[PDB]
Design a protein around this nucleic acid. Structure first.
Lengths: 96, 91, 108, 81, 90, 106, 81, 96
DNA sequence: TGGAGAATCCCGGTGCCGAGGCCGCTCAATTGGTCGTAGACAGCTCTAGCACCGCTTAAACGCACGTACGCGCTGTCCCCCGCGTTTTAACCGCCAAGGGGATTACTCCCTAGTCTCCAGGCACGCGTCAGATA
DNA sequence: TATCTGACCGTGCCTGGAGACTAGGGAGTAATCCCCTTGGCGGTTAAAACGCGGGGGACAGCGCGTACGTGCGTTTAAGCGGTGCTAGAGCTGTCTACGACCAATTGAGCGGCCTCGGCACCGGGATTCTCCA
């Protein structure tokens, strides 16, 4: 059959997900994650839909910016693969 | 609900006469105007409290704009602000 | 009485001087508010709105779109250095990111 | 509701890394990204619930999330202000 | 010029009797009290403006302490403030 | 009648009246309640007590009976919550925590 | 006044790196550190000059620098702040 | 005699991490402040405490930046700090 | 460098829903007058910032030498990407209670405002004890 | 251990906090009403999980060449003390103009309604574009 070399589909995905503007996390698992986090703070608590969408947009923007910093940390160590030490270094430099 | 929607539409029609705008972009522009208003008003309030003043003047807003906005934006914002104050006083 | 002339019209502005004044007095910023301060602030707000909207319209023209979506606003903000410095801690909803692949990621 | 951090699946983290420009992802990234997301969501949701409980409400509105995000310098345009 | 020097010295003699404090340390403590005051008062003012309220009460200060201060510090500060308010009312 | 201070009613050392005045002229709200200066004075007194406790411990660890700014810096950066509250704060004549990474040591 | 950035000497940058924990320093660190210091000082000094010219003063006060650093989230204690 | 390369550096690290004194000379920093402020306002005066405040803030900022630079150098399997580590730390903080 | 397969862009047709314009109106901005005080301006006092000189002394600078270390190269194996297949649970449409956000009214308690007065807090002089150097 | 030099409790003026009374308006409480959150059921189909091959890159080892570290002698200007001077920070006094405030008027913006064109979607075809020989 026909196989692409590893890296072509990855760069194609980078191009098509930086050209796009949609949300990359499924809505219902994020909603259940938000509800199970919020139930440890206050029980019998409802949620507007716009609140969950705002949380999803903020979370996606935060994770994308963190992965940009993680990628630059990985390039700094003469690598292409990102590792948990890259995320830990990025969060330590930001102050998280 | 009070919003800056019609004024943003007027400014857009002054700038781009044949370009429209959506509702989400209007919500973003309304939030941008509210955020910049809150920043400049807070800085001007802090400036008035620092120098023992009970009044916010155009001087306070001018140095708050000059503190907040970066160089070219600060210079141009001072330019149309001083032009507007001059035209308001003369007429 | 005379003809009721708007404060925005006598300063040559589209942004409301009266609404800016009433939000300044009710925002608990100072005990007094000057007369020229809402004029000056409305002029600054109108300048910044026009600066964002010009580049957003240019981005919409580059994508062959008559309307402005949040992607065009994000492109307008992050493609300009001063607007990116002003809005560096601001997330535009449904705005996406700039296209940026690093040079070492591309094949030789 | 238990164990919903597995709902943030591995292709979702892969897509979020593609948007950030990550060509190659190791397999230990996903647990760390889930923990990072849980820490961030806990920090935002705690302030949102505090803003809600000050208002004596039982619903978390969008403006509570916006004020929570503005509390730690992550201002979000497009949802009100 | 007003300062919190005598109150910081009173708290220090309340908890560390055989321990003085330098002038620069007193200036740092005065700046710390002013900074925490400004933070809690600004958060309470924002809370009052969000709820369309024209007063700052003990609820706004308690919510500001919960928002700004980290966990155990927030719990102990809320306990101390509630004890002081109930002792003031009683 | 006899004048009794509002700090003595609340059982505090920090001034309730000065905090009430600074709340009134600080332009925070149009009205300021009675319990808010008592609450904020109690919170400020507690945080002052915590910082001075850890600073006195740091001074006693160096066999010194006077708190210098270095002891306040050690007190702040040795406690996690006070470092979280004072993370973007520079303390003058404070120095840094002594930390050397493991890879630098032979 | 000219060429005054060279007063931040190589032993001074070395001492700052030793306080920061740095064991071994390149030879090109010093120019980069001088540029970073120049950018930081330009920002803080410009804000302090704006603060001291708003008050119609010709003397830069310590509170001007304190307010300027508090604006950029770099609050400095021990100077009346 | 001559010590091994590194032990005097570690002794200097232990010496300068327990002191609080300012590591930059006062007069060159003062002249640098008057040189920078000449570009904003001609014939401007400075209080002494303003220059000491600028020195304390600048020293603290450079020390924190060199800490993050050292973590960036350790992450790239090195002990020598290089200008790319400073650039990476300043990008992750968001100053570039 | 030539060719097969796959992806990507372009253009033509569809329809749909949200953006842009119109209308009544209502409430918030405008105009006119009054009044009290915030700050603008002039003046003076005295702090403290600037400039200069001598010196003595710690720190900086230039240079020599050597070793730790950065960096390029090589090999290998293991871990992740690409792709095909199966499962599963997300997504959409549609009801249905029903708890809770929003509105209105009212009535009352809490807090601004002001007069008075006096005692706690600030500046200052005197007594003297804690880190620092030897 | 010996000694030293400033950098750390009592007294007098004064001003702002406290006690007390009055007014008035903000907010708490009761009732109610319509939006909208949550839960459920069913189809469907898109995406996630799983499995497997293979290739390329992470990581360890190793040689080398050079660039910092360390040390030592020489230069140089930071730092301390002292003197002199004058800008200007800061306080006080007077007055005046300007902003808060209030009542009447009015038109600008806002909610509701309606309609049509900008754009998302689908498909045939050209055009790269990646990979293999």
């Amino acid at each position: 059959p026909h196989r692409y070399r590893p890296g072509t589909v990855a760069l194609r995905e980078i191009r098509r997900y930086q050209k796009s503007t949609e949300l990359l996390i499924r809505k219902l698992p994020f909603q259940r994650l938000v509800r199970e986090i919020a139930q440890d703070f206050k029980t019998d608590l409802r949620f507007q839909s716009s609140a969950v969408m705002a949380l999803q947009e903020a979370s996606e923007a935060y994770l994308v910016g963190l992965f940009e910093d993680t990628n630059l940390c990985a390039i700094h160590a003469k690598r292409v693969t990102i590792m948990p030490k890259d995320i830990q270094l990025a969060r330590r430099i930001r102050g998280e | 609900k009070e919003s800056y929607a019609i004024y943003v539409y007027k400014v857009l029609k002054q700038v781009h006469p044949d370009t429209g705008i959506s509702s989400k972009a209007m919500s973003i522009m309304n939030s941008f105007v509210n955020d910049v208003f809150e920043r400049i008003a807070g800085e001007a309030s802090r400036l008035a409290h620092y120098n023992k003043r009970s009044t916010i003047t155009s001087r306070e807003i001018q140095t708050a704009v000059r503190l907040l906005l970066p160089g070219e934006l600060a210079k141009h914002a001072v330019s149309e602000g001083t032009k507007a104050v001059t035209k308001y006083t003369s007429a | 009485r005379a003809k009721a002339k708007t404060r925005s019209s006598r300063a040559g502005l589209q942004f409301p001087v009266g609404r800016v004044h009433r939000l300044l007095r009710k925002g608990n910023y100072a005990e007094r508010v000057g007369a020229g301060a809402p004029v000056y602030l409305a002029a600054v707000l109108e300048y910044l709105t026009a600066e964002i909207l010009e580049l957003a319209g240019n981005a919409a023209r580059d994508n062959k779109k008559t309307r402005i979506i949040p992607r065009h606003l994000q492109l307008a903000v992050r493609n300009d250095e001063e607007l990116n410095k002003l809005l560096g801690r601001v997330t535009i909803a449904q705005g996406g990111v700039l296209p940026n692949i690093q040079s070492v990621l591309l094949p030789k | 509701l238990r164990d919903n951090i597995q709902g943030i699946t591995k292709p979702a983290i892969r897509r979020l890394a593609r948007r950030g420009g990550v060509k190659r992802i190791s397999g230990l990234i996903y647990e760390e990204t889930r923990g990072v997301l849980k820490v961030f969501l806990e920090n935002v949701i705690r302030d949102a619930v505090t803003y809600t409980e000050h208002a004596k409400r039982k619903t978390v509105t969008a403006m509570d999330v916006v004020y929570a995000l503005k509390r730690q310098g992550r201002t979000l345009y497009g949802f009100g202000g």
